[PDB]
Symmetry: D2
Subunit: 375 residues, 4 copies
Amino acid sequence: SLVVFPFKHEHPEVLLHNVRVAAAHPRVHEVLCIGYERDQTYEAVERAAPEISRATGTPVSVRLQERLGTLRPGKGDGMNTALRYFLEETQWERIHFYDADITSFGPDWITKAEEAADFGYGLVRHYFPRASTDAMITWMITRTGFALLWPHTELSWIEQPLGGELLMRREVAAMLYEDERVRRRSDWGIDTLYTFVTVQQGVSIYECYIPEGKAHRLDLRTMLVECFAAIQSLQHEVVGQPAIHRQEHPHRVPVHIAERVGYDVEATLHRLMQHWTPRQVELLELFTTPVREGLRTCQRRPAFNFMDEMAWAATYHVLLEHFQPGDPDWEELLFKLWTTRVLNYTMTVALRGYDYAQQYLYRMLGRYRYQAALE
Amino acid sequence: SLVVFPFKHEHPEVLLHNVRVAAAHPRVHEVLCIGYERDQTYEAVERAAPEISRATGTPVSVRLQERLGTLRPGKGDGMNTALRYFLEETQWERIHFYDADITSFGPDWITKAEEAADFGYGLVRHYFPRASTDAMITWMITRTGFALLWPHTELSWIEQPLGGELLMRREVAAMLYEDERVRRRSDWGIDTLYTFVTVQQGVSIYECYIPEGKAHRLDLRTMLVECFAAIQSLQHEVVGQPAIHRQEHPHRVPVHIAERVGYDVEATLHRLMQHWTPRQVELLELFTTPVREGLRTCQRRPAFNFMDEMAWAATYHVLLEHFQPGDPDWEELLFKLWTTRVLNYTMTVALRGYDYAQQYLYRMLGRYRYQAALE
Amino acid sequence: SLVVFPFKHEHPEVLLHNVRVAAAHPRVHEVLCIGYERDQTYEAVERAAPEISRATGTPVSVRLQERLGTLRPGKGDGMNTALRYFLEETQWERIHFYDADITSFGPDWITKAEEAADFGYGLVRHYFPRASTDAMITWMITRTGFALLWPHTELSWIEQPLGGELLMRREVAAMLYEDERVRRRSDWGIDTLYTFVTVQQGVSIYECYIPEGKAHRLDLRTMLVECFAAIQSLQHEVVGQPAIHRQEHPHRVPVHIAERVGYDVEATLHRLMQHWTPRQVELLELFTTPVREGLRTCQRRPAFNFMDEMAWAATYHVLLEHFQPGDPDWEELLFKLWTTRVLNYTMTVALRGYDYAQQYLYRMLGRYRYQAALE
Amino acid sequence: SLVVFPFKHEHPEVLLHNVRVAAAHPRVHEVLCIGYERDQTYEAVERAAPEISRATGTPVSVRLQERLGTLRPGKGDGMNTALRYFLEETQWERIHFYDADITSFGPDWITKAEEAADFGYGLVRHYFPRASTDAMITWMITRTGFALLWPHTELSWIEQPLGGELLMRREVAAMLYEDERVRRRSDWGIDTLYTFVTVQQGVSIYECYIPEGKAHRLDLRTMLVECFAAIQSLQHEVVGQPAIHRQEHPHRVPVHIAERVGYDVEATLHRLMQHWTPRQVELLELFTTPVREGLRTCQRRPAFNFMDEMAWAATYHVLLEHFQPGDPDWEELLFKLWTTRVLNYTMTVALRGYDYAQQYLYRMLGRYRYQAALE
Ligand SMILES: Nc1nc2c(ncn2[C@@H]2O[C@H](COP(=O)(O)OP(=O)(O)O)[C@@H](O)[C@H]2O)c(=O)[nH]1
Ligand SMILES: Nc1nc2c(ncn2[C@@H]2O[C@H](COP(=O)(O)OP(=O)(O)O)[C@@H](O)[C@H]2O)c(=O)[nH]1
Ligand SMILES: Nc1nc2c(ncn2[C@@H]2O[C@H](COP(=O)(O)OP(=O)(O)O)[C@@H](O)[C@H]2O)c(=O)[nH]1
Ligand SMILES: Nc1nc2c(ncn2[C@@H]2O[C@H](COP(=O)(O)OP(=O)(O)O)[C@@H](O)[C@H]2O)c(=O)[nH]1
Ligand SMILES: [Co+2]
Ligand SMILES: [Co+2]
Ligand SMILES: [Co+2]
Ligand SMILES: [Co+2]
């Protein structure tokens, strides 16, 4: 198997540790790191590589990403470069991707994915326990979108559709790399695209649980806009009824993960009152009253009680239809709109406890799916 | 929709309450109670029925079960009689079954099923939080069997395959009632059969979670042997890869359920030393040494440490191949064998806490599925 | 025993229920309700009383509170009126107080206190599980104060020093009513004074745990200022080393209590920007820089990250030394100061989970006790 | 301070690690290991000592225990030897004891005790989270005894009265070593005696919480009889009302501790049926019927449902009055009697979950204290 670590700016020792873990694994035949630019991380890896592959017997190499897509040159280009290399320059049966920033990485992650692949599956996705104010793009943007636009499909059931830790087999990777839609997604939209098109092609999927969680490095705005844009670009797509989808049963959350805070609330409330623009005030005219009045209040004081579940779904539709990717005002507006949803969820749900928050989030997708199936 | 309550011996007020709840529901067009015999429960319902249907506007009636199967006349005959009535004497689009003994029954159960049915599903199964020493037939017999015999299929993933609370639509019911295999299962085997053949036909299934649990009346032996027999009778069947199967994400277990005890341990230990027979001691010759020696010890003192996970799987295969349904010695032997498994799980797993027990049980099915895929 | 319910404005049926519970208890010899004014609740009780005491055999009566203290005529006057009545016009050995608003009241509360009293104790205080954003006066004002000013004593170890549910025996009541310091505390300061002087007199105290919690009616400002003022007035008091103090071991919090929210965050954030005054801005000159700059920001936008644990202790000392009871500006400033503490605790601690929040609060008192012992 | 590790047979590296931890601690001026005999552990320490003390600057030495008591030469003699050494041959202000077998020992244990000592306390006891089937001597024998014999005192409130991890200051040590009762307790009875007489002298006590628990090496019979014997020997003692006793607030149990099993159930059930004697059967004549009949059943099959809470208290009184220390039949009978109590608790309480078990155990002491205060 080929194991791939895409990296942009990262601590050399963190990446090197993961590289060494992967190389030492009996089922890994090659390690490839794909870099954004030729920075210090890059040179650090390039120096260590001869040594690592000499010690473990499995070859390790670095490359810059190629420009394969047509959006902002980001992780997509990184990942698709690995796909191309994997497909065109190696003979290996399977490819793994893991984020380079991971500090809780162990041989077990590779084993669990390899074993599931042996069982037949075409895509194996790792998924993790998460703090109740983490993963707000995942929940309020990706999974919400999937639920609202493809309620009868497997999409919204996938636990971590943005996750960069997965194993695909050669034919699945070929399938995706062929696909014009995924190829062009050079930015943060790439994981969304991998998730969507594998499901749309009826690839069978297993979700691995990694009980110890994904410790990593601790931009949010860019990721938010590009994820939403990814969903918007797919909105007219047609998806068949489910292929095989199974998920390893989750363990209880680790205490240290259940007990941490996703963000700085004071700073977020502040941020909500900044970067206003007469054009944004105008754009709000497109939204339902509660939302329009709600968000306008944020010029003077933080307001978010208005942005409950049903308000957010209404807002999501309007965004789907009018959001202009690349327009600074629309991006700021999406950022602010989403922020109020996060804040509302934080104060009315997250503050009720980890378990309450989980039961809520799942019920939220269910309510969205049901509503969607009504129209 | 038609709502059906199969009853044998039950407290009249308990059943009448459930009947009244169902009749009052806006989506229920008829209630049917199917009785084993014409006892006091029966006459109680028959007297109340004119009154209830007058007050709610939806018709309510009682009938004796018909003899439709070829095994012991039990619940199967009860449920298939309802199927027949539903298919042949009404025009309704959907049928529910709920156990008559349920005391925690509420309009919600009907709503959740009807809503899932609207979504498209062919079978909707209710499932509940359960005490860690409950559902030992479910886990050690049914789910174990499904995992060991059809590891690549959806069968072992179904949460409560013995569950009597479900909704099917007309074509799914027709399809089951048609089927020689389910029709003949007049005994406790019926839920196993409903579960098996719906999955084998690729019916799409949704599992509803009812967070408050299923409070009901608190024979075990009969149920055990007939459930095992059901599985044994299906052992040569071939099952395709999964159809659509989705399950509502579960809430945390209610405290009162997590904190209760499934059985009397002292009495069970005693029961293990009773009803011995020279023929049973001989039959043990067919089992691996640890098991044979283990079970033999039980003539003098309770012993069960020997009956771990791998020992039970070995035992299971031997049972599948040699267990003679209706033979008193085999039934007693199955009962004792299983009892050791339950005791072993109780002392080495359940005693470790509710969560540990759950993570264990799910991993057990996984280990069994993996092992089965190996041969 | 005499059981006493002090009431101001309450639902007649809620109080009448509690009255009836107490009167029906075999250990209760009289029930007394003490009213603030002769409103509808009062007339409701006065009408029902003859009937209740006829049915249960134990006498029930209502009275207006007398003016016995020298601050705002509030709960103190209510409770001391009961004390006077108890001591001067009855011969009973023990007196209970319970808030009239309680809806989870049961004969058990009385039993548990009566049994503890039998054991020998002089004061029995009931304490309950509480939502993690509840009891912010209790934690940030009363317990904090106790820990900061009397670190070596039992005071800060009392679970719910503001609690209105307790049982005292005749001599304890006599001792309190005698005391000019407690007599004069006619306002919300009274429970603080009851707690302080019983500990100062070395009365032996037992804390009863009521596992179901105290459901009650759902002013904050007046209570806040009067509680703080009570502490301030005691600040030069000397207190001896601990007498007997024991507390029933707590059960796990009920889910419904752990999962509810103390307050409306948006509204609180808004309130923090209101009722400013040039005089308040000036008064801030007396506080450390982080706090002064912090609170000032609140004229434009909510700010509270600055008001951590240590910042709060710093603030507390300044308040102890300069806060003028009755001065509208000081009262407003204390309200805002405390609100920022609550917000800080909410976002950095409470959001981490009920358990984390409890471990934190107890460590906070520890950190405060230690710090105080240093000077 | 002097830190003492008493050892009998232990893994050299485990003890040496703890010695090195203690010596490296800035507050520790000397380490002393006290051995049972001159075995391998002993020689291993004797060799390492020069080296350790050389490296840390704080002297380390080993000695055999002196024979100072009049019972079996065990741990008591070991600890009292340390006491003597401390008092007679050093000038140090404080002494710690820690079990030598501890594998989760850290500088933190010493710090927490030293800081509490700084606060004024005479005795500091460490206490830990424990598995719900651990500490059955502690609960069913020591705490139960203290509750039943001295209900109005602090004794039954001490968390871990058998605990070997504590810090005492010079005068407390002197006071104990002076005392004929404690001196003569050369066996396992010693911790019981340290606990009892410090409380009887009104020494102020603080209980430190060590949240990570006490991992140690995994005889039971001997310990059981000598702990019971200790309590029996004190039964006519008179104890005053409480001196100062405070306990650090506990954190949530670590998962790994909540999830482990204190013993082998099958083996225990077996053991209950062994080492019977006609004289034991006769001795049972002294006990209440349910118990006499119950225990007799154990000759044929395990029985324990009979040995609930009230049955155990009745049994305890009989034992207090008739148990003959040193009589093999009485010792066997106590062992069996206790074993049924443990089994009953295991099956009716422990199996209900860790929290339920704790709430139960504390209520048990409460029920016992109340019952005791009745006569
Ligand atoms: N090659 C490449 N890697 C990237 C790029 N952007 C992010 N990454 C890497 O993708 C992985 C996930 O990114 P990260 O910033 O940790 O986002 P996270 O998903 O929030 O954990 C990390 O290894 C990043 O170094 C990019 O533009 N090119
Ligand atoms: N008609 C009919 N109903 C039965 C028969 N046996 C059991 N039942 C009913 O089927 C439902 C489930 O039975 P129950 O004894 O509660 O088993 P459990 O809850 O699944 O353990 C109850 O309503 C019983 O009254 C039978 O032979 N005929
Ligand atoms: N007699 C009298 N009772 C009062 C007064 N103020 C409050 N109470 C009562 O004291 C009890 C506690 O007050 P409540 O408003 O519920 O405060 P809580 O402690 O936050 O629950 C209730 O029964 C009130 O009706 C007062 O001025 N006089
Ligand atoms: N000096 C001495 N130490 C002993 C004796 N018996 C036990 N110990 C030590 O006392 C400590 C506690 O004993 P241990 O067997 O671990 O019992 P437990 O941890 O309380 O169950 C350990 O360090 C033992 O090595 C004895 O007779 N003499
Ligand atoms: Co990352
Ligand atoms: Co039932
Ligand atoms: Co109230
Ligand atoms: Co030990």
